[PDB]
Amino acid sequence: AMAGVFTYETEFTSVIPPPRLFKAFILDADNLIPKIAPQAVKCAEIIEGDGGVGTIKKITFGEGSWFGSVTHKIDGIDKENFVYSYSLIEGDALSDKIEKISYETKLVSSSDGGSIIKSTSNYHTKGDVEIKEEHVKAGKEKASHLFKLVEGYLLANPNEYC
């Protein structure tokens, strides 16, 4: 069985500068996201670890999507360079065809006082590669929708995460 990596890259832009975005969206995700987006995320529960590298966490989805769950593994947190690396180790997306999906979310500063959210998705493949363009685009739409709610909240409550 052939091993490969299908790599997809995308960017989101934010008005919020990287330090604030990282404190909010990444370092306090488990608390902030189920609160702002209840329909999208019901809860975030740590199964193993203290929230840092090696942490295993089960995310349960709300009424918005065809609610299942996902199990993420924290691979890396760079609090200086605003890098968050994690893998989907249990979920609907995984099959005999896709064994693992590793992610890297980097926050880059904009000269206008904002951020560029750079997301890389690495689909670790086994056998014939068959990835639907619509399935990837739907993930990108859900990620930008959740993110837009993060930006709004942050702009409505400017003192939060400073």
Spell out the residues 6+ positions from residue 128 whose beta carbon is closer than 8 angstroms to its own.
Answer: 97
Angle of CA points 96, 103, 46, to nearest 5°: 90
Dihedral-angle region of residue 26 (phi above 0 means left; psi in -120 to 50 means alpha; beta otherwise): alpha
- What is the stated resolution of the deposited model, in angstroms? 2.3
- Tell me which method was used to determine the 3D structure: X-ray
CB neighbourhood size of 109 (10 A): 14
CA dihedral 34, 36, 40, 44 (to 10 degrees): -10
Q: What angle, rounded to 10 degrees, do the helices at 133-156 and 29-36 form?
A: 90
| 56-60 vs 69-78, strand pairing mode | antiparallel
Secondary structure percentages of the chain, helix, strand, coil, to 5: 25, 40, 35
**Cα separation of 97 and 99, whole Å?**
6
In angstroms, how far is CA 125 from the centroid of its own chain? 20
**DSSP code for 21:** H
Q: Which architecture, in CATH terms, is 1-162?
A: 2-Layer Sandwich (3.30)
**Cα separation of 144 and 42, whole Å?**
18
**Cα separation of 150 and 116, whole Å?**
14
